[PDB]
Amino acid sequence: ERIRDLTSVQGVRENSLIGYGLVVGLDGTGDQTTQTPFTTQTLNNMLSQLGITVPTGTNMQLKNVAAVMVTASYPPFARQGQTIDVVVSSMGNAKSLRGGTLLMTPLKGVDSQVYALAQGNILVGGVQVNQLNGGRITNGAIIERELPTQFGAGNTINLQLNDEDFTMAQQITDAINRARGYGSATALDARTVQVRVPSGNSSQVRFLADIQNMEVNVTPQDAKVVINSRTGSVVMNREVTLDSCAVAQGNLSVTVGGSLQSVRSSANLNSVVRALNALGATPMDLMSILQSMQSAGCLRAKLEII
Amino acid sequence: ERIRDLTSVQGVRENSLIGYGLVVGLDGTGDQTTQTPFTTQTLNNMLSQLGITVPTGTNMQLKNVAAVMVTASYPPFARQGQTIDVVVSSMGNAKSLRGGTLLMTPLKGVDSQVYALAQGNILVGGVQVNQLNGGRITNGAIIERELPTQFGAGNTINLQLNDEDFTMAQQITDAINRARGYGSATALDARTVQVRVPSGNSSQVRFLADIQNMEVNVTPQDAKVVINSRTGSVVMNREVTLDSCAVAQGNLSVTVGGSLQSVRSSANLNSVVRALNALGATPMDLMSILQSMQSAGCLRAKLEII
Amino acid sequence: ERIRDLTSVQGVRENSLIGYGLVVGLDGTGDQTTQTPFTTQTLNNMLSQLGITVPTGTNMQLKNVAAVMVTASYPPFARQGQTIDVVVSSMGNAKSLRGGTLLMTPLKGVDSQVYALAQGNILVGGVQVNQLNGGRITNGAIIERELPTQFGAGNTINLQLNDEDFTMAQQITDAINRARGYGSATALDARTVQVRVPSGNSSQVRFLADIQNMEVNVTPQDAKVVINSRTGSVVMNREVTLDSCAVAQGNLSVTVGGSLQSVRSSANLNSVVRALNALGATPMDLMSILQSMQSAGCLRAKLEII
């Protein structure tokens, strides 16, 4: 496993940008302006800015426009001239945004500053129907501001690990030290590894490029089981082991001779899967069985509901 | 991979232009002037400018015109006499813009300055029906203003990388240095490469032309999975690897003997695809399975919802 | 590729002319004067100018006339006696303009100056019905004013490139220098090439005539994909390349064995097309697949929604 696949750099970080905008076209299916006052008000503001002042008292019952919120991911080291993808979601009661156009919406950060400008054409999917009130614009937003960064300054860079682990951090530090000079890396906690790099943006970039593609083996993480209970999904880690026990569940019985099926001790995932399958049950019954088993022991893993 | 395909120049940048206009013709299907007051007001303004003053109190119930918004992409280094394509989208309640004509709409930037003039004939597509409230005009807009630029001044040019990467920046810098003189390029961050070029517009243009077509190999980017959840699409990178695990999903069972199918460890994309297919499920079930797997580990990639 | 096919001269430029007029005849199907007050008012103005003063209070309910807007393209170097084609579009509620006649409408520029006079017979096309509210008049407009130009003055002429490109500008400059004397051309940016020409209108015309027909090879432009999403069209450049990946889309599965079809790496357009076709899907599904792929990488091209 590569360092880039399981670690992130301290200075590299994404930000969230949000903005309000209007979508035109739509062949009808737009917002009902009677129930969406902000749509008409924003359209009037745009018209007044462009040079048209509609009288305050007017009908303004249009159906080819929809008020939308546009969300974007400000990427790390964003440049002024670069472009990013945006997601446009209907705000009022618009039926669909099939072939709409997003018009010059300013994308701002949490500080209320305009960081991008988004404009373009929405693309939406054409019984599992697609979401017609939410679309994506590729390269629809152009950056306007650049976030200052400290990258290239100092002599220490922090590699941050997803799903922190003391063994994982130790392995990363050992790999970095073996590849680079002695004492190049030092683990600060279960999630942070401080690496010494020479001063200078170019030198730091070269060091990070060398480190990121480094190959590090992944030690056994933990015996973990995930139960959705909302999508009807159950997933077990390769480290899950099952202790000998007897389980009785409603309508479940020995194939053959009745209830109270025996569960043999299983050390590996294959044995655990075979024993659970022999204890024949649907995933919904399996969730309850696993919960009861973990409550009573007999399950050498931690199970979480997602 | 060419430098032009994965990098953009600092000075080269597009801008967004928006404007309001009217479309005539349409064989009916135009805006309902009763519910679209701005259409009649703008038509009256145009008539008064042309020399016809309609009395304020009049019916003015027309159906051959539609108020539209026109959007254009101001290209880099735009010249005064050049032409650009525009997109016209209905604003009010117009049924269609099949054979309409856009009449002399000024396209302005975010600074409220007129940067182009758009006029021409709309082209729209003639059960998947086409969008009849939005059309495109090719070469419909003529530029009027030219944006000042610094290109040709200074001695440093910044190449900006899409989907920043330290390894990618290092590769680009190494390729530029190998092709050109020693020290020609230097990576400033994961997304920016500063290249030294001689003073002068012609010299800079020649250097950029030489650099852009340069061939640079693309290193493994990252193990990334994209789930739409709105268009029912799942895409996996070539770097995605699957860890051994057992997954149980509603209505899914071993072909054969029941639920809790085993997923063998897979290092390459082919093995991952074969294992997931053996765990037979539709894309919608696959999305939930992937989410649960990533939550529980067993999936050496980052998955994002788009 | 000829220089004329991919470049435009600085002094050569088109302008847009707009005007208001009336169309007579039509065998009925004209504007409803009750709902189109400007039609009757303009007809009364014309009658008064001709010498007939209709009383202000009168019915004037006619159906053989329609108020129209006429648009024309003022060509570069327009002469006083020359004629241009015009487009006539219905303004009010006229049903059709099948055999109408446009009567002496003045075509004015953005400066409110009369630049042409348009008069003639409209030609309109006689389930895909033709547009009967919009017609074209060939040579229907006669120019009246001539725009002053600087052509023939100075010693430098700027060739402007459509779809600017540093490589394209360098190629054009190299071709011009090779054909003409040393240093005849110099690229100023990605879109402008300054060419030195002798003083004098005749000499400049001869130089431009020699340059325009010059043959210049077109280098690979860029890996670009265009998705309409409104006309259901997808177009890929010859430079588009596909990276190895796995894609799962709703209702799509391996021919054969299920979802999650593999996409082999393809370097050329033929391989990309064959792989995408093997991943059998309609264009609407292909648009979503391409969007997801580009989001996840695996697509070495920039895709834009049109």
Place this chain on the structure above:
Amino acid sequence: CAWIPAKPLVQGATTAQPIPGPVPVANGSIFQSAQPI
């Protein structure tokens, strides 16, 4: 008399000048804390 000096019960300034706040830290995040109390 009404001209005798008097002190209004609401003593002190009736205005507060807003503080500009803390300068952002170039940590790469748009979000900036505000010294939690």
